[PDB]
């Protein structure tokens, strides 16, 4: 249920389907992107590029 480590590469923006965040009980508590191929990408919630991607996805969903 938790991320073991954060993904270190570039966020593939065109491949993103959605996101969620994991529980606060997690050590590497994360924003998790889900790709259209169904892969998960474990990300630092405080990283600026992560935040920008979520803001884009939120605009699609709201």
């Amino acid at each position, epitope marked *: 249920e938790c991320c073991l480590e954060y993904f270190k590469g570039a966020i593939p*923006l*065109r*491949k993103l389907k959605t996101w969620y965040q994991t529980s606060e009980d997690c050590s590497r508590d994360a924003i998790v992107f889900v790709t*259209v*191929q169904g892969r998960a990408i474990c990300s630092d919630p405080n990283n600026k590029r992560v*935040k*920008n991607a979520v*803001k*884009y996805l939120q605009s*699609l969903e709201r």
Partner: antibody
Amino acid sequence: EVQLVQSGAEVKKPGESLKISCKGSGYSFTSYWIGWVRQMPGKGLEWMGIIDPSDSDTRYSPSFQGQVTISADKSISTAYLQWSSLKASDTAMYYCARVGPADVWDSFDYWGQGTLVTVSS
Amino acid sequence: DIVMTQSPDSLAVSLGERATINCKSSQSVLLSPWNSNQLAWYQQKPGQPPKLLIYGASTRESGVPDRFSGSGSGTDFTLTISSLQAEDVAVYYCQQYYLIPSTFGQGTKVEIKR
């Protein structure tokens, strides 16, 4: 320079199948997405779908999903648009075009010359 | 989806005069973290493929003459031709690429007034 070369005009009968092609040259083909755009006679541009030739990730407009198949063969730097069974209402110009590299998505920065498809009995 | 709408549908302008075409998106196309409006303008002459003129709402593509400019933000955009030349007779399309489907406006035909 960047070229997109589309196959020649097609005159077909209703119910026939058809695959048209869009060949890239002068750039890294797998580095950019390719789109297909329909223009029915005297009408406007309709975004049909796009494909990432690197992995064949394909996205369709809801209006065209299940109605045409878009594909690509990266070994020969070619994208395709295909119908299993043409209708007279498929009569249109079909353009392929390259999606630019900007985030998140981008405009169509280069266009093929178009393939005219005429469907009639 | 985002719906793109252009006004007027047809425009007649005297040679040498200013032409203005408007484009509205049904939702904002401002990609905020990138401060870019995800909006393009294309020109299509009879029997030719469309050609990209303007992207990011206001950036002229390489080799596009200075008389073409784009402005606006959010949901309202304008294509201006400062002085219509004879070779500018064409159909002009706007397009959003904020998301996919990256849909086009219906097009605006520009012709010479006489």
